[PDB]
Every structure is written in structure tokens, then in C-alpha cells.
Ligand binder design. Structure first.
Ligand SMILES: *C(=O)[C@@H](CCCCCC)[C@@H](O)C[C@H](CCCCCCCCCCC)OC(=O)[C@H](CC(C)C)NC=O
Length: 253
């Protein structure tokens, strides 16, 4: 679930709704999968797609990822306006996709940010090291002893996969390897991302209960509506948070 098939499809149907209504396109969080969206997708009365981060995705920058996701999206719906959402890391990518579409043009795209905005050797190790800790129970200092002395990113990814496998032999090595590696690149991409223009279109922030607009005022002119959703950073897309999100999506559209 914190893993994606690195040879899987980038664009995927999260529901099978058959309708002439414009699809909702949903951008993965940092983990890269669309698993988080399953409940939302199963409850929407609109065709919904998920974008997952695979080996095809250019993770050199948010710019390149956004342009690639736009490319995928066009194979389903050639022309905008588009209905795009992003959850947490995905909010930043969704923003850049809409910024790029705006630049390509008076645009009427719909943008929903689910608890995220244009956020966020040693940094390399702390990234892979944090990665290992999410897959194992291994104490911080023992992971850091295996990784810090190593001499590049690829040596650390390989050691990370080894350490995770020792704890969980049934995880695919190719998936673990892609996930460790891409995680570093996703962080790097984010760290180097700088919106180059104010977004004019309308943005809706849906931030979890547990500034107010996540600094969307410095990057966007148009009606930034902020709704607060019951739950924490994870649970706003399940249960009571979810049901309220669907209602807000259903009336905005
Ligand atoms: C959204 O997806 C984020 C953001 C949460 C806060 C909302 C503000 C937008 C969420 O997944 C949190 C987290 C971010 C990773 C932080 C650790 C970075 C390490 C610092 C080193 C940087 C040096 C380059 O995601 C996670 O904690 C885990 C994701 C990975 C892929 C396992 N989730 C674990 O369950």
C-alpha cells in the first residue's frame, strides 16, 4: 500500500462509472499509489481516475511530473477544462498541472487540494533512513549505521531494500527499490519546486480538522475557498471526512 507496481499504469480507473460527465483526476500522495482514494472513488457518481507514480514518471522536478500527468490525462480527455484533485504531496503536483494548463492558455479547471498545497549524503541518508523505519521497527541509529557510511544514493537504496526484506521477506524487491529511490527524488523535486507564476483560477482547499489556506494566497489570485474536514491528515479521506468531501465536490462541480 506504500508501494506501487513500478511497471503499472500511470493513469487508472478508480471506479467503473460509465458517464459523459467529465472525470475527476486524482494525484497520489508521496507514497505514489492511489490506494488512499479507493473509498472516495467508490462513492463518487462521476468517472474517477487515479495517477500513480511509476517508473515512467519523470521525477526530476514537479514541473516534469506535472507535464507528464497532463499528457496521461489527455489520453482519456483530450481537452480541458479538467477536474483535478491532489492529496498531500499530490496537491502540489495538481497545482502545477493547473498552472501549466493555464500557461498553455482563460481557463476553467477545477482544483481540489486534499490537506496539502505547494508543500513542502546526509539528507539522502535521512530520507532512505526514514523510509526503512516505515517498513521495519529498526531503531534509528542501526539503520543510520548501515546507510551513512555508504557512498551514493544507489548503495543506500540497495541496503534499505536488504534491511526491509530481513523484516518482511514477502515484499517485492523491485517495488521496494523503486519506492526507496523515488521517495528521495520526490523530496528533491519538492524542495526545488518554485511556482513561477500566480495561478488565476479557483482553488479549493480541503484541510483536515486535526495560514488557514496553507499559504495559497501568495501563489493564487482566484477564489481560494477553504473548507475544514473532520479527521486528521490521514482520516479526512475516510468515513465522516470522506462523506463531507463528496458533498463539497458534488456541489462545486
Ligand atoms: C502528504 O502526503 C504528507 C504531508 C503531511 C503534512 C501535510 C502538509 C502538506 C504525508 O505523507 C507525511 C509524510 C512526509 C514525509 C516526511 C519525512 C521526510 C524526511 C525528511 C528528509 C528530507 C531530506 C531530503 O509521509 C510519510 O511520512 C510516509 C511516506 C513514505 C513514502 C513512507 N508515510 C508513511 O506511512
Amino acid at each position: 500500500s506504500l508501494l506501487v507496481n513500478p511497471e503499472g499504469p500511470t493513469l487508472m480507473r478508480l471506479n467503473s462509472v460509465q458517464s459523459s460527465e467529465r472525470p475527476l483526476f486524482l494525484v497520489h500522495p508521496i507514497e505514489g499509489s492511489t490506494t488512499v482514494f479507493h473509498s472516495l472513488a467508490s462513492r463518487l457518481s462521476i468517472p474517477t481516475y487515479g495517477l500513480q507514480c511509476t517508473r515512467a514518471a519523470p521525477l526530476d522536478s514537479i514541473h516534469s511530473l506535472a507535464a507528464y500527468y497532463i499528457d496521461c490525462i489527455r489520453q482519456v480527455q483530450p481537452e480541458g477544462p479538467y477536474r483535478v484533485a491532489g492529496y498531500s504531496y499530490g496537491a502540489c503536483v495538481a497545482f502545477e498541472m493547473c498552472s501549466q494548463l493555464q500557461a498553455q492558455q482563460p481557463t476553467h479547471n477545477s482544483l481540489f487540494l486534499f490537506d496539502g498545497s505547494p508543500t513542502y549524503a546526509e539528507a539522502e541518508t535521512e530520507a532512505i533512513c526514514f523510509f526503512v523505519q516505515q517498513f521495519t521497527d529498526m531503531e534509528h541509529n542501526r539503520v543510520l549505521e548501515a546507510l551513512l557510511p555508504l557512498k551514493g544514493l544507489e548503495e543506500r537504496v540497495a541496503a534499505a531494500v536488504d534491511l526491509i526484506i530481513k523484516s518482511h521477506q514477502g515484499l517485492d524487491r523491485q517495488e521496494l527499490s523503486f519506492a526507496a529511490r523515488s521517495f528521495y527524488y520526490k523530496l528533491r523535486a519538492a524542495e526545488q519546486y518554485t511556482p513561477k507564476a500566480k495561478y488565476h483560477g479557483n482553488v479549493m482547499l480541503l484541510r483536515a480538522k486535526t495560514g488557514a489556506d496553507y499559504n495559497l494566497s501568495q501563489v493564487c489570485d482566484g477564489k481560494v475557498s477553504v473548507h475544514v474536514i473532520e479527521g486528521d491528515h490521514r482520516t479526512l479521506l475516510e468515513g465522516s471526512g470522506l462523506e463531507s468531501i463528496i458533498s463539497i465536490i458534488h456541489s462545486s462541480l
